[PDB]
Amino acid sequence: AYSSTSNIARMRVPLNQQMFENRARTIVTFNATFVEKDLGTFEDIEHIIIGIDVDNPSG
Amino acid sequence: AYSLLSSRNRLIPRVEVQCRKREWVKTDPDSPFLNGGREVLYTPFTAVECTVQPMRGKAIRDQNNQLMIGGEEDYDSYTVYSETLLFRAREGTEHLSDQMLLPDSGGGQTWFTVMKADMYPSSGVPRYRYYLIAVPVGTEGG
């Protein structure tokens, strides 16, 4: 997408020491969005094991 | 006084070249400027006999095709010995510098604009030396 624009400067440039050539220059700024793809994946979680310890005073 | 140099050579070949005088004029009726829509008026003529030679060095500004950010631009120049009087531009006037048509490095023919003229007022013999630069391609100079 388009964002903004800079100042437009008009210039005169000598050529072969005989003539002045008309020119101009500007900078136009755009927005963009870039997408890239990973090189792999991790393994899934198929099985989960959890250990539990319940501290109590009776034993 | 000089005698031998006051006559045409008989060993080195010489050629004639074509030239054209140049003025300028204002065309816009209402613009308040001296420039207006500038125009140039031409009147052709020829040089009696001339010798053409190229630049002697290889300096970067004397090369024919030059690399610029736009593209391979074009440049040419010469040194000319002649027995005809050619004039440069004069300020506060409507006269421009004389031009003359010579072959170029690309095989075509283009106009060269007089930039430096050498004269020897105290000697008397009418022999001159000129230095010329090719008009920018696609325009008629300035």
Q: From the CA of A39, how many Å to the nearest CA of chain B?
A: 40
Among all chains, which residue has been given the structure tokens 């420039």? Answer: B35
Method for this entry? cryo-EM
Integer CA distances (angstroms), A9 to A2, A24, B70, B107, in order: 20, 5, 18, 38
Tokens of B29: 């009726």
Nearest CA in chain A to B75: A16
Phi and psi at A40, nearest 5°, equal 165, -170
Facing residue for B75 by CB, picked from A16, A19, A21:
A16
Residues B37, B27: Cα–Cα separation, whole Å:
5
Give me the long-range contacts of A18-23 (CB less than 8 A, separation at least 24).
A18/B113, A18/B133, A18/B135, A18/B136, A18/B141, A18/B142, A19/B136, A19/B139, A19/B141, A19/B142, A20/B142, A21/B136
C-alpha span between B55 and A15 (Å, rounded):
19
DSSP secondary structure code for residue A46 in this structure = -
Resolution in A: 3.1
Cα-based distances in Å from A24 to A11, A27, A46, B5, B70? 6, 11, 65, 53, 13
Judge contact between B100 and B135, C-beta under 8 A: no
A37: phi then psi, degrees, rounded to nearest 5? -115, 140
Number of other CB atoms surrounding residue B132 within 10 Å:
22
> Residue A23: which residues within 8 A CB-CB, separation 6 or more?
A10, A11, A12, A13
Q: Is the CB of A24 inside 8 Å of chain B's CB atoms?
A: no
CA–CA separation, B97 vs B89, rounded Å?
5
Those residues whose C-beta lies under 8 Å from the C-beta of residue B79, and which sit 6 or more positions away, are B52, B53, B54, B55, B129, B130, B131, B132
A15 interface with B at CB cutoff 8 Å: yes
Kindly determine whether residue A18 and residue B141, on different chains, have CB atoms separated by under 8 Å. yes
Do B88 and B97 form a contact (C-beta atoms < 8 A)? Answer: yes
Strand partners, B79: B53, B131
Give the distance from residue A25's alpha carbon to the nearest chain B alpha carbon, in angstroms: 13
Which DSSP string corresponds to B121-133? TTT----EEEEEE
Spatial separation of the C-alpha atoms in residues B55 and A44, rounded to whole Å:
78
Inform me whether the C-beta atom of residue B110 falls under 8 Å from chain A C-beta atoms. no
